[PDB]
Amino acid sequence: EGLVEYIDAEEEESILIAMQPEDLEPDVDPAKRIRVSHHATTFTHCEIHPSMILGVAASIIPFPDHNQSPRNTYQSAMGKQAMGVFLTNYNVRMDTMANILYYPQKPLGTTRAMEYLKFRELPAGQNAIVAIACYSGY
Amino acid sequence: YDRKVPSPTGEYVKEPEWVLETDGVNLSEVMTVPGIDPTRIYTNSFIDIMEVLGIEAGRAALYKEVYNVIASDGSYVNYRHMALLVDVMTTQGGLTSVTRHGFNRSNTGALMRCSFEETVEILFEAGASAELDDCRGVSENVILGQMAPIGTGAFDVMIDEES
Amino acid sequence: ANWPLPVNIRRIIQNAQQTFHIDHTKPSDLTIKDIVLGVKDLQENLLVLRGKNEIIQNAQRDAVTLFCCLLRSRLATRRVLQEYRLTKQAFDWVLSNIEAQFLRSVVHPGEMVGVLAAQSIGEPATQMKVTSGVPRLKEILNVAKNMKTPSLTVY
Amino acid sequence: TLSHLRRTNTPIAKPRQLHNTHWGLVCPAETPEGQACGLVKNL
Amino acid sequence: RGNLMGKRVDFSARTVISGDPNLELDQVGVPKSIAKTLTYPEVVTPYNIDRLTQLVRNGPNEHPGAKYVIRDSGDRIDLRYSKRAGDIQLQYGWKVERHIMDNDPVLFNRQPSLHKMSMMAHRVKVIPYSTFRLNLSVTSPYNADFDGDEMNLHVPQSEETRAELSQLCAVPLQIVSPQSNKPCMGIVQDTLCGIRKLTLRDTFIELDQVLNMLYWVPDWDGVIPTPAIIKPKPLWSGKQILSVAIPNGIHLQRFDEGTTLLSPKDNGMLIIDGQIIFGVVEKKTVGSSNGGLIHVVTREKGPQVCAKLFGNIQKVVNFWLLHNGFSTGIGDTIADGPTMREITETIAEAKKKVLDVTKEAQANLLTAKHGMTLRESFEDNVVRFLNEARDKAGRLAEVNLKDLNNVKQMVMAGSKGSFINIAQMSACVGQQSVEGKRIAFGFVDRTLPHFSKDDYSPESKGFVENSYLRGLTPQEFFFHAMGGREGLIDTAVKTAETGYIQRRLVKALEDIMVHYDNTTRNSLGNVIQFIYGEDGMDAAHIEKQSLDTIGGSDAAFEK
Amino acid sequence: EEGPQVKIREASKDNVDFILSNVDLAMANSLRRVMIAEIPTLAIDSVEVETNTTVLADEFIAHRLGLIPLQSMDIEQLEYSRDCFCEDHCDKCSVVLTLQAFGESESTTNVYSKDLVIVSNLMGRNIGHPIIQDKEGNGVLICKLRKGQELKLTCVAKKGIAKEHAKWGPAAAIEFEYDPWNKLKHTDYWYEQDSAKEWPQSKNCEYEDPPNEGDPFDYKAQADTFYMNVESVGSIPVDQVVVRGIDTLQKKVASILLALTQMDQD
Amino acid sequence: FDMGGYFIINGSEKVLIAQERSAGNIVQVFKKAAPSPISHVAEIRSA
Amino acid sequence: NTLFDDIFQVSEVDPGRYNKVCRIEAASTTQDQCKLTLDINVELFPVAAQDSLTVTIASSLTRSWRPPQAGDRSLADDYDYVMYGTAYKFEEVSKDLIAVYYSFGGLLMRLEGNYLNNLKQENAYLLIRR
Amino acid sequence: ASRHGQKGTIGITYRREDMPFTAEGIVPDLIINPHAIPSRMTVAHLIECLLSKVAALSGNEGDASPFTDITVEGISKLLREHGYQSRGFEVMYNGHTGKKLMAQIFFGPTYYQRLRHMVDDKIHARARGPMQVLTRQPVEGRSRDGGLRFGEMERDCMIAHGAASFLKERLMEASDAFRVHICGICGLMTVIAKLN
Amino acid sequence: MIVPVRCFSCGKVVGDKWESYLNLLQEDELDEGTALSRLGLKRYCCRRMILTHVDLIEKFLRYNP
Amino acid sequence: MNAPDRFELFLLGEGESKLKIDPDTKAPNAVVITFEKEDHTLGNLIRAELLNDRKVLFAAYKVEHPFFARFKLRIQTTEGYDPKDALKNACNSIINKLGALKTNFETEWNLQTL
Amino acid sequence: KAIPKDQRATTPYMTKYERARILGTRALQISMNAPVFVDLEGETDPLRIAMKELAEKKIPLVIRRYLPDGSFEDWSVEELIVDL
RNA sequence: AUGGAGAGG
């Protein structure tokens, strides 16, 4: 119906993308982040949602925009090393080695992208009542 | 540039002078220009210092450069180490690189030099020129599996009847 | 002025005015000969090289020149008798202790300091408008015919 | 599994740096560390 | 290179490492199984025949025990399978391969071995669980954390070689390193933050806690020090009870900034006769600095006393911190309202300055600096302005922080953190840069498809007004991702080239040593230095002293 | 009585909220510790699985089986299996209870704790019966069976301490708070602006008097009044939890005293 | 939950990693080095 | 016996980023050439502005510190605020002005006077009343 | 590891008695050191802790999506509404003594994940074992019960120390050692040593 | 897998509350918060134990073996 | 794999006694007692109760390592006062306080509802 | 050839390598049940016994210090100074 | 054994 297009980088070279769909409309909270006003007009395309710039592994990171980038990278690398339920039929497959978490849990802090990655159905970790403190020094 | 200068009263006082930095190097002709101090002129190219002023000035410039690279990161290494490096680079007569083209072309033992970079060709040419090995190189006794004459093995232990 | 030197003198002095519990309101039982000739003879025992020929002796005095400068600067008659007011016993103790600590500070023969130097240079390099750091160090060690930033500093 | 099934390999000026054109096509965060950094990428 | 210069060896082990606040500096926590596996041959002598008989009687699987028994003929008796593992008469001259036991000298190593401090001799203390355990003051010369780090251990197989380990490669002997003529070990992390929190003038300790801390010191004389406060309540100070860890005859003096023998801000450091007179103790003192306390105690009392000092300080400080507590929350990264406002308006006036300079440059009114392009001068100006902006907002953020701010406390202690962390977390993370320059134009005359062509504005070329507390925008996030990416890349490249350069350096000055005439030579006898280091002094026994003859006026000199 | 005092504020089958007066901090804290760990309780220690064609693994089920709360009223007149002279376990130290389940209907056949059947002889001792605080009367859900899935096993419950395993925990979370007004100043409050407005006000503030600003710091004061709330899992009643706690602490103190008595032997 | 997109060889699940390459039939001009005799090179990979 | 005794007038109180210890600045109400700076534990003995504290230096009232028992043994004080420190510096401003530096577990003190029997010794009992 | 590149191994394990405890009686399932925060700048860890706490209490699912207008201030407000410190702090008591702690502890739910690597899968030790066939040196790998390679850098370290005897021991008695016969004329391994 | 028998943090039994939780959710049509509140799960750790859990045994029972 | 048994935290080993009283060589009339198979639960209590005795000069306890459930307890009293007597009296004090506390809680519980 | 007992230029102080070597060799001898020339006084560890035997200068060994030219100087353990 | 993939500091 001509509502959405498929754009590669070469064609992306000659377009103007709006970051948010609210950047087409013509006192504030100090808490929120500082966002530069749209000084553009001739938009041809608009972004679906910026969070789509990430990959599958990076979409599991809570508030990745509040972290130093190499930390997001490290988490992206270590997420593939976490234990959980990799398949529902794990008890009928003869894999060389498979680890399945005893009691998986869907994280209290989720991403809207986690919905499509089936992470809340097949999680890889538990919510630990954590404490940041200096105790025994161990 | 700011600079500490001995005041006629005694104490060192900051006396700021004007110094000309330069992109481009040709020490052979710049120092002979009437107008500047021809005894304080310096280049970051120690290779030119070695050619123009001599091998000792080249040593000082080399140490200055290495020290500058080390201290550039705020670090600090004691003098004797860097000095040892620069000296072993400059004792041959010129600027001996720290590569297979530099010190590995020396007159040391065949095994020692063959234990680094080019191995087979070294053993070949050494086997062709009939070279004698002193076996007082560390890596050589390492190969031979002997107590190398280094540190604890730099001396011999014997007995003398004093009982 | 601040430079790495073998024996620390300050700690020895402040240890001297603690070991003997000297009061700063009492005339020292020293002599001009005691201090002057004492230090002058102290400089004789700071042996780094132990040869008998002239060459080795010259190399010796050249090797102990700086530390002797520090020694004379710190153990001046005025400074000894007024700055901390040392006694005879305390002074002899200071001299002997300085000698001993100096003889301890000598490098031990057999010390593989080549590898030690190479490691002492290579290790901090891992923790790293002209070119500096690892590429510049690479240039220096390779003796680059063409350096990325040739500069001429003219005074 | 999801991550491995959507992987990009690169053989051999600055092929390791995150290029601007990678916006929305390649993940800016997910890449192996140590050796094949920037070369191996994920969609 | 693979079989002669370095070959695989027996009597070796490797495991995941962890810290233990109750282990000595020269000790190593060794798992029981490793203690059962690794073995040492011990000749049967009248001095130890009983103990050896007991160990053989225990055999393997039970520590302490033995693995094999070698006779005179050379026959090897495998205890775990032999029919006579219960009845053995140990003859004099026989060897007994026993399990590794306590106080055994072993070589501890962590790759990459960059210097001699990467291989140090430790005393074995066999413990349960499967982790190599080490002190928190040996972590630095090894350069090791506990996020999965593994280390290797080698066992000597004769008396002379374990002597070589215990008399040369010992950890206390490696405290003062000849690399930077300074101690390479010190108090860090919780012990540092704790020793900072303890020596405060507000920190007072009542009777019971004082008694416990005192008893926690192994070298405690058993003499209760007279409390700084008598009436109304007998209270001690952190300094006063910390002094118990410091040996007698220790004199430390260091003036920092406005230190006038009274110290209104309680800075500097004065310690007399093993008793701290005044000054908050932190990294400048208890750390691994040149004139640090560790250096002093090491060169004065000895390496053993200094290691035991590490022990005492650690035990006491960790004990006090255990019952005091210390944390870190997001609240420690939150500046006041007006502070955040001043930060915002600072960034605003910065971007305004950039706007003025840009508009000036576009009108061809800009004058190029001598030796560089108009464009280069512009870039330099904008970059410098944004840097001054991040620094301004950063200092504005640091000033606002209280003394009770945990992050600021860790910064003060020197435990972990710095100014830039405060700046980026609370104020502004600043400008992103790749290859020394700001984010260039991947697309034609623009960095992203979300900008118009030719947009040299800060928020375009990769400037981030937002802090980590507020959150980054998509563009800011991507630019930051580019920068970080380059970080990882040049990191890998750096460790590669540094590794190679290090190898070359070592292979170059391999056979260089000092002979018995203080002459630095090589395998050819070629003199490098007639006198090593041009003075003949070892780098370890050297301290930076002031030559007060070279400075001052001639009048003051004469006076 | 004569020493410490107790003022019960709330009481139920699961919880007891009270105030402990005239006591040293160490005694209260140690009492908390004993209540948490060193109280004897009966729990599943052994599991003999005959047939297991369910989804869950063997020891996976054995785990939650062990974690099931059992009656531990007369646990004191039971004996440790390590103390009993019998082989393995008997009826004077252990309580054996079988478990047999099998999918029957097309729907999912649930397996709870009510399906556990006491087999061994209790001989008049109130013990072994799995606590069911459930409304429907099912209890802790062990697992779920399909249609043809079967689960046949037999558990052996032994006397143990929560210091050995958390499955022998007679209590859940013990609430503990002293000096709600920080008049002893054992805590230096963190803040950004106001230290009082940011930190909420405790419930136990109503029982004590607010500090007057016209008063200096009371340095001679100690920790006397404590506010506790003990919660029981169900195995042992709350009153019996705290009573057995006190009696346990007292018992081991008395054991140390007895050791002191024994060390006087020639 | 298995998304597929792989093969099975001898019981082993195999995945074909997408191989990145330069686009063919593209005209690109490159500036050559300084010691090089040629200054610019206009090349195209014909497919 | 006693080493020093005088009545001072508190002229300044300074809580330099502290909340339990305030540095005090007082002057002698007898000698116009005498002054005193002294860190005080306010949480125990509060010292407001414009107060007149009675200050005393003593040598006694080494061995370990036994339990108080003030109502059983010889306390030799009945003051309000007592401390124990160590002299570490004897500075001489002029011939008519001599200053001494005591350290009470970190709580420092500078006493400037003229006429003294204050020798470098561990013995330093500072007693303050009213 | 958490979900922010904050990895680390278990140093030790404490029972609930020794563990610190809040006034509610809640004990931390895990204790991490504060020092692993400022030098790494993982603010989103703390933020996800706060959010997970609020979402836990309120019984909802906290939205931790990347680019949203969810700020620490609103989350703090919500947490304060539930009767807790808005910045995630909690007054805790030292489990050993029961005495309060001066500083309050950042306490709350955080999603952690047990990573791949475990100690018992990494631990290795060999007194002596199977050698290779070609070079007669200790075999390679843990799964083959092999020995650790005494690398060139290790050799360099032992040289730096001066322990020559230890170097020889590591290069003879530890690894491979051979007795060979040499002719006194040509000096090669031509000797046909007929022993016995 | 299946609902954990007891809470990790403290140790309160939470295994008998799962079905009742689901009943409070879909039958009485309440939010997760109130449902967890009626089940006597005051502490947010016990609350977490049920709120965070995903019943995966239901998908496991789909297979025929 | 290398983990010690759980009962090793409250069950005494082979040849291990409960208390190990040793003469403190540091200060005169002092004693260091080694408590086996016990933790802070008993140590903190005993130590805190030893401070109540005004004839006790010193009293401190410590767990030298959390791996092993044992703690050392140093006690120092006045001359003519054997420290073991102080320990015993402290213990009996604890016992009496706990007994009275138990009686009080029971009598209080006998007056409650629900 | 050799170097006479007079005009010896090498350090009279025993180097750390010399001390470690002597202690090592002596500890080896003791480890192979050799006659001890000092009172054990409770010591049974061959290394410690070697150390105590070093402090009393009851070690009948000698040190041959090589010179880079080929010459050598002899220094008995009894004559050498142990200041470390 | 050769060769290859991925991962850990």
Ligand SMILES: O=c1ccn([C@@H]2O[C@H](COP(=O)(O)NP(=O)(O)OP(=O)(O)O)[C@@H](O)[C@H]2O)c(=O)[nH]1
């Ligand atoms: O190839 C590699 C990669 C990593 N490493 C090692 O791994 C460590 C990374 O570990 P880390 O990044 O988690 N923290 P750290 O480096 O200790 O720095 P800081 O936050 O200031 O405390 C680095 O310090 C290297 O020593 C290697 O040795 N080799």
Ligand SMILES: [Mg+2]
């Ligand atoms: Mg680190």
Ligand SMILES: [Mg+2]
């Ligand atoms: Mg690491």
Ligand SMILES: [Zn+2]
């Ligand atoms: Zn039985």
Ligand SMILES: [Zn+2]
């Ligand atoms: Zn021949």
Ligand SMILES: [Zn+2]
């Ligand atoms: Zn709970």
